[PDB]
């Protein structure tokens, strides 16, 4: 009825780690023309109104977010979501120029949950400062994950969950610079992106972040990083090069493909001339993009008219470290991402499939 039936259990029963095919669930409306709704009504079962959690008292099970088959499956589905909904007019992949219809859509992500079938169960790590790997001492079992919007993006993680307690740093190996670093925030900051309806450059857009509320969160992100790199001067820089998809904060808003410059978001002088007020990041809507799905290029139709707007909660930041400076009183971090599985890890880190018998 009201969400969530909590239960305790002792000793019993035996389980071992395994992989299995997980299905999804949603509150998708079969009347909605919106594309995630259209996809989820026929991809996912209706969510159970009586979810059940079970605290497995006095157990410690080890987790590893960096090898979790749930992530590979969400990627499988989010791809299927895009290949169904966001059909590019021209797709240059498989030594082929693929021309298919590209009608303008109603696009906004809804949550999807991931769920085990009979014979299997999800274990959930409730240790409130859990980085993502190794031992968990407050373990529980669940029927499905929490609601996860399949928000595809780079640099900034959007509309996700927050870290309950403190800011958390996540990496497969933090001493390895080549490994991406996921920052789970404990307090979110709104990023309010807009292509205004001029009635004129239709591709000129921007995002507005309360530079007050932000540069506080960043100073805390800095101080948390100080702990992992023996008190060293943590220092941000722009991305040192690459594709626009990763050199800029790239995301999809209302169907359109936004590219925004995050130079102004990682300003060290603010960590107090200016800074305090409103950070306005220059954005650019693009039609020809590189595809996160598979390797290739694609073109979509020109943007719709009227005022495009998304306001997203920034719930995490993808960074990469520089390295070679080890050596040095400083550690340099730059906006990263690109691997869309890292986004699904930013939510599925605390979950883990297991087989019963």
């Amino acid at each position: 009825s009201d969400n969530l039936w909590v239960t305790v259990y002792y000793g019993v029963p035996v389980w071992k780690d395994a992989d299995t095919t997980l299905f999804c669930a949603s509150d998708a409306k079969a009347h909605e023309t919106e594309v995630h709704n259209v996809w989820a009504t026929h991809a996912c079962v209706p969510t159970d109104p009586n979810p059940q959690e079970i605290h497995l008292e006095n157990v410690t099970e080890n987790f590893n977010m960096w090898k979790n088959n749930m992530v590979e499956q969400m990627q499988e589905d989010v791809i299927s979501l895009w290949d169904q909904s966001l059909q590019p007019c021209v797709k240059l992949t498989g030594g082929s120029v693929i021309k298919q219809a590209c009608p303008k859509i109603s696009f906004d992500p809804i949550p999807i949950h991931y769920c085990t079938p009979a014979g299997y169960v999800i274990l959930k790590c409730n240790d409130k400062n859990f980085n993502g790997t190794g031992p968990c001492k407050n373990v529980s079992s669940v029927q499905c994950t929490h609601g996860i919007k399949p928000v595809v993006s780079t640099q900034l993680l959007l509309n996700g969950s927050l870290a309950e307690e403190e800011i958390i740093i996540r990496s497969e190996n933090l001493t390895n610079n080549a490994k991406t670093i996921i920052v789970h925030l404990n307090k979110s900051v709104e990023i309010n992106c807009t292509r205004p309806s001029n009635g004129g450059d239709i591709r000129k857009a921007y995002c507005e972040i309360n530079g007050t509320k932000w540069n506080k969160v960043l100073k805390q992100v800095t101080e948390k990083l100080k702990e992992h790199f023996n008190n060293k001067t943590i220092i941000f820089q722009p991305p040192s090069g690459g594709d626009l998809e990763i050199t800029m904060h790239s995301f999809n808003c209302r169907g359109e493909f936004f590219y925004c410059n995050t130079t102004q978001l990682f300003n060290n002088t603010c960590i107090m001339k200016g800074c305090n007020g409103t950070i306005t990041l220059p954005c650019k809507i693009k039609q020809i993009i590189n595809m996160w799905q598979g390797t290739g290029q694609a073109m979509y139709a020109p943007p719709i008219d009227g005022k495009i707007n998304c306001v997203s909660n920034i719930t995490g930041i993808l960074l990469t470290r520089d390295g070679g400076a080890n050596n040095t009183s400083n550690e340099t971090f730059r906006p990263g991402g690109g691997n869309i599985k890292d986004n699904w890890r930013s939510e599925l880190y605390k979950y883990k499939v297991v087989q019963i018998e």
Partner: peptide, 27 residues
């Protein structure tokens, strides 16, 4: 991600290349 094409594109900016999923990151 094609890494070769990435490494090569990055060398033009005095950098090495590295896949970020399907994209090309330079460092």
């Amino acid at each position: 991600x094609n890494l070769h094409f990435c490494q090569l594109r990055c060398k033009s900016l005095g950098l090495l290349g590295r896949c970020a999923x399907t994209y090309c990151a330079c460092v």
